[model samples]
Target: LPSSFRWSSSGPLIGPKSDSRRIQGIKDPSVVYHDGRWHVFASTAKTEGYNLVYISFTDWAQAGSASFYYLDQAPLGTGYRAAPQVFYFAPQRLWYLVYQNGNAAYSTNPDINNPAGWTAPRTFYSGMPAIIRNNIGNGHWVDMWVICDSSLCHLFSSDDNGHLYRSQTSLSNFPNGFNEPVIAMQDSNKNRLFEAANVYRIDGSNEYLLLHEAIGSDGRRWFRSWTSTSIAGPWRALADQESNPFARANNVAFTGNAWTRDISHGELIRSGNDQTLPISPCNLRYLYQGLDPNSGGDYNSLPWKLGLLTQTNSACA
Candidate 1:
């Protein structure tokens, strides 16, 4: 397994547009590359509350000029939707947009290019599971991620209070029958086991990789990684700490002057855009959210922007 990592990053490829539409930040991005273009679905903080936005570009440099589509104009409707995860469900021949909307909600579309094709939101669970209810405590359960193997589909998420939970449903009965979630991992300090968990199936192998964001002692955000053979895990640590992290400011070399200290919530540029979310071990590129170190006050209003990180050294390569 690759132990230490170094990366070169692009400075803020996408940022908040102006007032009314995107008054605050663009955070929690989910992306897919299909039909020679990159489709991005991300959470936007508006004057009212958090909502979703869509953008597409044939090249990274064109991202800034791509038209932003406010999802409220689509059938997906409006109000309090955030943290999107987009993937193709091969069995159904449709694209799934999974996110948090009070519960674990999802929308499906046949065409990745048409935001209006998305069906109305539906949730995996009828109500909050008893385990999440008891353990969630003062923290909110958010950042929903789904990954699958041959037989089962797994839903992974986090509570700000220091726990990562996994719920499973047979592959044949997914988007419907997720059983009660159980704790996959936990920590005494909430910040160490925080939100934004992304899991992937490593290409050309039987192994899996999990990246969960954590807050450093310096009050900046970084990511720690874990790997497992099964989609459901006994996730052993890979580089699960600040000193040697999966992605952090210390390990990242900015193409220009450093723009942000926090390597916050974002997704990997996957090898394939499907439910499995596969990424080649040697070709690691992460599309993550970051912001100015001095930016503070209302969390929603923070100037979060999107950036790309290309691994400079790869042991597998």
Candidate 2:
């Protein structure tokens, strides 16, 4: 049920906007809420490569202004260790922090609110089926996301080669061996499919949503969305035309353009949630990464900050 969309915003939620993280930019946030608190994991520029930082807040409004801690330092002295995601799997009561490093690494701990609670990074995703895992070829695996449906678990990641993929295994087999492989979503025209793909199910809908991120010709980050019923299957676009991005540039509501102009990579943060599907609109908030203008039109060299995307409660109409 792809529908017309419009939303207002509460301006930016976080950032220095210019030369903040040791004079580097920050982008790509993954946020999760638990125990009356919101925990965020995001990528930011650093003197030593790219670092994943963690911050917390009791509400969304203070998210932008809250202080954060260093979750993981960048591999090198300067580069990117971008796109860190956190999900507290109920089965094991484990919070897995997923991110990229040519391949992904995962750290687990029971404490979700602590800054220095997780274990050191270990090979979280090596590939499924011994064959593919053996011949990972030469590139890094980018953007890994995990979701749970009852006892079954789903993992999404892109080869960082413009192709998206999915794999499944029982919760009993999670964080280790996923299945062979299936193409969850990709660019139909084969032009390009960028990284940072987020998958989720709306409340009361049982409907699956995939947000595809890419930088268009206009030089801004854009998102095209797709929906389906089963975890896998015939996905349909939410846009007037399937090729068009569902949200991008001015199509989305933002408090201002002075900070970040585009809604790029981040996770959907929910309020009043209770382990239920068909999550209502009032319980949903898109906590996304925004580009700060201080970077001066330099998408690659600029810094990114956090912003809130809220759909009105009456949107069901």
Candidate 3:
């Protein structure tokens, strides 16, 4: 397996539109591949508020060639759906779409392609095991993610206070609730740590990589990575202390200019069909959104469209 940083873009998979859920822009993409079909879920930007959208294709390349379907919206009750994450639980053999429906609402529907097939929004954090519920405070949790191991299911999320937290429950008790969450990582740097925590085992190795989106005074929003041996981690920085970095700013070891201004929130193109996380560095293809300088930043609200990222054996010494 190859190591080190060389992240570049494969170009925008989805572009900005003057109509529909992406009128303003598209952000926070979460993907799940089931049975050779790719189900793409993302938070859509509208003039009024945020909505959840979906798109499907047999091959990933198809996405760049076409448009996504306006799948669904956050029910009136769930705040505003954002940072939508979709994953399959091997234990239950069920598909889950977890998003910030207000304060996190999730629905499980086996057939991921059926847009209207979702079970109505259900509270995510409120139903957690009592111990876990006690740790949460206002603006305590957002950008939720779920991944299961052989015997346990791990839940990861970010707190507004610039920290990442993790909690777990037995495989049998998952989707029902997770136990008390505790601080897994913290970075109180000038930028207030990081948000959007994503954890995955690097493909073909025991090394697990954790990613968090961060922006410093440069105003160049980007991602930072860390490595660990297990899901319940004592993570170590994957790059030198904030100077020589993993994937940051616009100068990635990648190709293409789609996200040159900033590579923001999104998921990784995993190794397996049902898998949604990256397992190998070589096979790691990132699914993030790009900012086009042509769009012009108004109120600093940059227009984002879906973009792709791949690793190279060169760049950024």
| Prediction-by-prediction clash tally | 0, 17, 9
Go through the candidates in order and give the C-alpha RMSD of each one to the true structure: 1.1, 4.1, 3.9
TM for candidate 1 is 0.98
Which ranking of candidates, highest TM-score first? Answer: 1, 3, 2
For each candidate, give its TM-score against the true structure: 0.98, 0.82, 0.84
**Runs in model 2 with CA error above 4 Å?**
16-23, 46-48, 73-80, 127-140, 188-192, 240-244, 255-259, 271-284, 292-300, 312-317
Ranking by lDDT: 1, 3, 2
**Per-residue lDDT tens digits of candidate 3, residues 136-189?**
444345788776666777778776556677878787776667667777886655
Please, what is the whole-model Cα lDDT of each candidate in the order they appear? 0.89, 0.63, 0.66
lDDT (Cα, 0-100) at 102 in candidate 2: 54
Task: Name model 3 segments beyond 4 Å from true.
Answer: 1-3, 20-22, 73-79, 127-140, 190-192, 240-242, 250-259, 273-278, 294-301, 314-317
Winner of 2 and 3 under TM-score: 3
In candidate 2 the C-alpha lDDT for residue 249 amounts to 52
Looking at candidate 2, what is the lDDT of residue 18?
37
Q: What is model 3's C-alpha RMSD?
A: 3.9
